[PDB]
């Protein structure tokens, strides 16, 4: 569920055939008319302007959104040699194949809102019903339940659930109610609000989020707090640690190119070697520029080619070269590039391995990754440590707070 930004594109008609575009859809099927195929002649002309998936909403200023299929065809037929198209890219931004939380098929936001309202109204609060619902609904479904709750009760859902839930259970439920950008931005402000900084949390978010995720994060951070994320990062960091975080937080990393640039993979690997292990000291800006700007699939091969030049891998080299917040930052970044699910499985184990529980990290990883790569986090938590992530959550938490985390885990092993 996602409609892109509108764009005006002018096309031309070929002598053999026509505009060179196949279309499908219409108001009969409750779907817009979308370009399905682009011919090789008009492929080079419309490179970057029109793509398969664009929904033609206006033709020469005529709104063809609520129109049928053959009605839109006849408009393109009876047009001149050129047509100006207003298009909007239809994508499928919600969803992931490796999330543990599955979409509830018999979903009804009005019924779930009423069942939660009666669960809040029950004396002592029926937290079990609230947990069994919100932990088995996708984030997009939770927003619908919040809108249905306020529609029926004239009261915000998150404010009523804060009055009904307490402890770590409240933190889990209230975290699931925020959108991914809302939740990531709220956790970022928490790492910087005050006179100190939770570098462990600031590093975890900035190093692991992708370009698309960081774009919406920077947007909602300015909307919720009236300050750009880059300013607060600058105010809370310093030195080369500030440089690495501000650069990573831009989300302007190169997209994975269609070619495997072998010459750049060897040159980048040798550059990292010459900038650290080979020389006295470290060329920190060279390490920053390479690991922040290149794509992840490129840097994965770079780090393997780096094992050809250095007797220590990138992680071991980072330990021997830099220290403190800069070292920890680079270590988290390389883990996210090499194997991001293993990065999270390692952080989950560290949050529970000792006395007590670092609940701040356990909750955030279970909330933010339940619909991204939790299935991959689980498969490697079991592989490395011998027992399931379910087993560790079972041993480290109790009560309804345990039940919610095990729901976000999604199963044993």
């Amino acid at each position: 569920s996602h409609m892109g930004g509108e764009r005006t594109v002018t096309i031309r008609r070929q002598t053999v055939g026509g505009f060179g575009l196949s279309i499908k859809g219409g108001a009969e099927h409750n779907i817009p008319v979308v370009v399905s195929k682009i011919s090789k002649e008009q492929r080079a002309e419309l490179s970057g302007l029109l793509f398969i998936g664009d929904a033609i909403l206006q033709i020469n200023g005529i709104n063809v959104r609520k129109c049928r299929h053959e009605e839109v065809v006849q408009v393109l037929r009876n047009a001149g040699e050129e047509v100006t198209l207003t298009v909007s890219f239809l994508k499928r931004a919600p969803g992931s194949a490796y999330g543990s939380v599955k979409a509830y098929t018999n979903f009804d936001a009005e019924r779930d809102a009423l069942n939660i309202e009666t669960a809040i109204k029950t004396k002592g609060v029926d937290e079990v019903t609230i947990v069994n619902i919100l932990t088995n609904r996708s984030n997009e479904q939770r927003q619908d339940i919040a809108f249905a709750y306020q529609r029926r009760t004239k009261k915000e859902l998150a404010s009523a659930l804060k009055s009904a839930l307490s402890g770590h259970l409240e933190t889990v439920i209230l975290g699931l109610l925020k959108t991914p950008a809302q939740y990531d931005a709220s956790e970022l402000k928490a790492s910087m609000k005050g006179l100190g900084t939770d570098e462990d949390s600031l590093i975890e978010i900035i190093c692991s989020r992708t370009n698309q995720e960081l774009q919406e994060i920077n947007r909602v951070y300015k909307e919720m707090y009236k300050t750009d994320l880059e300013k607060d990062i600058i105010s809370d960091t310093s030195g080369d640690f500030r440089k690495l975080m501000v650069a990573l937080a831009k989300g302007r990393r190169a997209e994975d190119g269609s070619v495997i640039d072998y010459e750049l993979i060897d040159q980048d690997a040798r550059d990292l070697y010459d900038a650290g292990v080979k020389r006295k000291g470290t060329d920190v800006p060279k390490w920053i520029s390479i690991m922040t700007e290149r794509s992840v699939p490129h840097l994965q091969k770079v780090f393997d080619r780096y094992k050809s030049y250095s007797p220590y891998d990138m992680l071991e080299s980072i330990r021997k070269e830099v220290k403190g917040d800069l070292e920890n930052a680079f270590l988290n970044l390389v883990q996210c590039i090499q194997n991001k699910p293993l990065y999270f499985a390692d952080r989950l184990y560290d949050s529970m391995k000792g006395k007590g529980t670092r609940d701040k990290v356990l909750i955030r990883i279970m909330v933010s990754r339940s619909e991204v790569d939790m299935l991959k986090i689980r498969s490697e938590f079991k592989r490395k440590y011998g027992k399931s992530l379910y087993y560790y959550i079972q041993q480290d938490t109790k009560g309804d707070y345990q039940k919610a985390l095990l729901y976000l885990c999604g199963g044993d092993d």
Binding site: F19, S22, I23, K24, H69, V73, L76
Partner: peptide
């Protein structure tokens, strides 16, 4: 269906 131009 699918029309082509």
């Amino acid at each position: 269906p699918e029309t082509s131009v």
